[PDB]
Design an enzyme around this catalytic site. Structure first.
Site, short mmCIF file in Angstrom:
data_model
loop_
_atom_site.label_atom_id
_atom_site.label_comp_id
_atom_site.label_asym_id
_atom_site.label_seq_id
_atom_site.Cartn_x
_atom_site.Cartn_y
_atom_site.Cartn_z
N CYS A 1 0.51 -9.55 -0.69
CA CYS A 1 0.03 -9.86 -2.02
C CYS A 1 1.19 -10.73 -2.52
O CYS A 1 1.58 -11.69 -1.85
CB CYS A 1 -0.16 -8.60 -2.86
SG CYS A 1 1.30 -7.64 -3.08
N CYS B 1 3.69 -5.05 -2.22
CA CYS B 1 3.57 -3.60 -2.32
C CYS B 1 2.41 -3.08 -3.18
O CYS B 1 1.87 -2.01 -2.92
CB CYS B 1 4.84 -3.00 -2.92
SG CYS B 1 6.32 -3.20 -1.88
#
Ligand SMILES: O=C(CCCN1C[C@@H](c2coc3cc(O)c(C(=O)O)cc23)NN1)Nc1cccc2ccccc12
Length: 282
Positions: free
Chosen positions: A215, A219
């Site tokens: 991403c 996380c």
């Protein structure tokens, strides 16, 4: 002795706050050292200073393409249902980690890239382009030639078939770029996420190679896709542990990469998402 009636269907801030803890005790005890990430020569390879890969789990690059390439990248190995090196959780690359990014993809034979962000989200930069867009000329990242042949454009995500020519060698990677994100308490917006995980698993299943998933900080949403993908891969084999739990799963997954799911919302979506999977199937 064989849940073929998976009774798991049965406040959330509390299970989560317990995950907030743990990773607090983990530090006070200097349990998972992130020393390699703190080296003065890597300060510019981390997108956030308080999000460092655990050493023990860090992905170590051996593939060297220069007298400057180090063995470092913000990346961690997440184990799958049968063993390790199943998942590779990473941050969106920076202008200075693209080449590092591609070496990794290459050195580990990664065939699938699931990016859970948008170049820009809420007037802000989250990722440096590492992928190629159709129509464009090739994009060189050191010695790696990234190209794009085609790309299926669905309602909530794009499928980019990429051609990566390192030397005179050519590999085909598949980028699943997930733009829109379906929050938690919207029990209907989840569906597309499963759309992805199924689609992803339609390309790679029983393959030794890991799925690179990132991403922005590697996380938040990254943990969700992994946790979910992991429970459904379990569900896909009924191998679901009897005492299985969304909590338990995140706990250890949170042992490989710090804060693998960083918000309660994310923790809950991971949950309603497993629920639907079980409710479904049958
Ligand atoms: O309130 C928070 C989290 C606040 C934000 N985060 C998210 C982050 C953040 C905000 O918008 C974002 C958009 C993104 O696309 C990403 C990302 O992709 O990597 C990260 C962020 N910066 N801080 N959480 C807490 C987490 C764990 C333990 C806690 C104990 C006490 C209080 C709060 C706690």
């Amino acid at each position: 002795q064989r849940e073929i009636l998976q009774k798991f269907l049965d406040e959330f801030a509390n299970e989560f706050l317990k995950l907030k803890r743990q990773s607090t005790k983990y530090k006070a005890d200097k349990t998972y050292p992130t020393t390699v990430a703190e080296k003065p020569k890597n300060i510019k390879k981390n997108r956030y200073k308080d999000i460092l890969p655990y050493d023990y789990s860090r992905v170590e690059l051996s593939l060297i393409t220069s007298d400057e390439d180090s063995s470092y990248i913000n990346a961690n190995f997440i184990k799958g249902v049968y063993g390790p090196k199943a998942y590779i959780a990473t941050q969106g690359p920076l202008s200075t980690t693209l080449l590092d990014f591609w070496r990794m993809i290459w050195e580990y034979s990664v065939l699938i890239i699931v990016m859970a962000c948008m170049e820009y989200e809420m007037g802000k930069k989250k990722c440096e382009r590492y992928w190629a867009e159709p129509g464009e000329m090739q994009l060189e990242f050191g010695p790696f030639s990234v190209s794009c042949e085609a790309e299926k454009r669905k309602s909530d995500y794009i499928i980019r078939t990429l051609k990566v020519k390192f030397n005179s060698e050519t590999r085909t990677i598949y980028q699943f770029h997930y733009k829109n994100w379906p929050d938690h308490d919207v029990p209907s917006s989840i569906d597309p996420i499963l759309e992805l995980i199924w689609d992803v698993r339609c390309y790679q299943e029983d393959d030794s190679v890991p799925i690179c998933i990132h991403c922005s900080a590697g996380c938040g949403r990254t943990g969700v896709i992994c946790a979910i993908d992991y429970t459904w891969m379990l569900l896909k084999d009924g191998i679901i542990p009897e005492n299985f739990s969304v909590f338990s799963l995140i706990r250890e997954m949170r042992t490989q990469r710090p804060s693998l799911v960083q918000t309660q919302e994310q923790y809950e979506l991971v949950y309603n998402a497993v629920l639907e999977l079980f409710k479904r199937q049958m």
